[PDB]
């Protein structure tokens, strides 16, 4: 296809430019190439150090994608710089591994116990593993629904309470510490219907154990309160976007601020104190936005990625301040950085919780990048 070739040519040509600019825009850039593409990515909490070594070791929960051969749940170790056969190892290796029935849409560990890893299967089953019970048959199977799904979310204030979004217009909620299991299976403590179409994502409120937000193709954002009796009455419903909403994420330093990403090429800034008013809209992306993560370190900056192969980093503070037309190009003032090291759609990304500004993004070309934008791009 002509349009394909043209695209490809632009992709490759810009990527050359990128590489050449690398030393100016970044302080760290690693580009590993997994055996199989990953659809998920999340940094584990822990960090491992050794006296003497000029690096610390961090880890990522990755996944494999092959509708052909065997799939796996992966744990990758990564060597990151410090303040400053039998041969030394590559900076990136795969420590743990676990055969997985079908690609891994998402893989997220449980806050209260990082050994517990929840999984989203291309099936209808939501799997749970303990990467210790496997030094593969999952330690838990979660009934709940019929269609496949990506949305997945552990409750920080309620050990075990996990939520999942699905293509069957519903949201399940199981307690992993579920009384009994009747054959490694937990049915579903609740199922939230109230949603016109496919639910794209789900997210527990960070501080209020009985709250969470859903987002779906029915272009709406719904806030829920498990304490309610009707599993159809969402505490609130917001006409968040024009197109389908693919994701939502709560700000780590707030109890009211939210953020959603839609196919409408937009990221909406929401405040629970008044879901009637959309605080602001981040524009610049040129395609669907499936990911939106806040920096675990700075309350004012968040990131977004999608089909345009670009990862955008925005700084709320700069929302407003006037800018010169010849500068007001490239994008709005809230736009702080654009990462264009990826050559395909970015399937997922994660902020390193321990090393401010280190981020890990995964692409469909099975490429994995661990980068960190130049300090002068955000300092001074």
């Amino acid at each position: 296809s002509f349009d394909d070739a043209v695209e490809e040519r632009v992709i490759n040509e810009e990527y050359k430019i990128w590489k050449k600019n690398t030393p100016f825009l970044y302080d760290l850039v690693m580009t590993h190439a997994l055996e199989w593409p990953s659809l998920t990515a999340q940094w584990l909490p822990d960090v491992t150090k050794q006296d003497g070594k000029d690096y610390s070791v961090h880890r990522l929960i990755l996944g494999t994608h092959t509708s052909d051969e065997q799939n796996h749940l992966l744990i990758a170790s990564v060597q990151l710089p410090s303040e400053d056969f039998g041969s030394v190892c590559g900076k990136i290796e795969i420590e743990i591994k676990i055969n997985h029935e079908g690609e891994v849409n998402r893989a997220r560990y449980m806050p209260q116990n990082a050994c517990v890893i929840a999984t989203k299967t291309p099936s209808s089953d939501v799997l749970v593993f303990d990467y210790t019970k496997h030094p593969c048959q999952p330690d838990l199977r979660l009934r709940g629904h019929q269609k496949e799904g990506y949305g997945l979310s552990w409750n920080p204030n309620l050990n075990g309470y996990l939520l999942s979004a699905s293509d069957d217009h519903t949201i399940c909620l199981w307690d992993i510490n579920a009384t009994p299991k009747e054959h490694r299976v937990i049915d579903a403590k609740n199922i939230f219907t109230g949603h016109t179409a496919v639910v794209e994502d789900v997210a527990w409120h960070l501080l209020h154990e009985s709250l969470f937000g859903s987002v779906a193709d029915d272009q709406k954002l719904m806030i829920w309160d498990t304490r309610n009796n009707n599993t159809s009455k969402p505490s609130h419903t917001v006409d968040a976007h024009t197109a389908e909403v693919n994701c939502l994420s709560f700000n780590p330093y707030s109890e009211f601020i939210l953020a959603t990403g839609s196919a409408d090429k937009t990221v909406a800034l929401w405040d629970l104190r008044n879901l009637k008013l959309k605080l602001h809209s981040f524009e610049s992306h040129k395609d669907e936005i499936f990911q939106v993560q806040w920096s675990p370190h700075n309350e004012t900056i968040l990131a977004s990625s999608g089909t345009d192969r670009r990862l955008h980093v925005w700084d709320l503070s700069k929302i407003g301040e006037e800018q010169s037309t010849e500068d007001a190009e490239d994008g709005p003032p809230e736009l702080l950085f654009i990462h264009g090291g990826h050559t395909a759609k970015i399937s997922d990304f994660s902020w390193n919780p321990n090393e401010p500004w280190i981020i890990c993004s995964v692409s469909e070309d099975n490429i994995m990048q661990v980068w960190q934008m130049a300090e002068n791009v955000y300092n001074d």
């Binding site: 100016f24 670009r310 490239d330 736009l335 654009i338 264009g340 791009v377």
Partner: peptide, 11 residues
Amino acid sequence: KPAIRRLARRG
């Protein structure tokens, strides 16, 4: 060199 911020803006 605040053109790095500008450079970062392009993409």
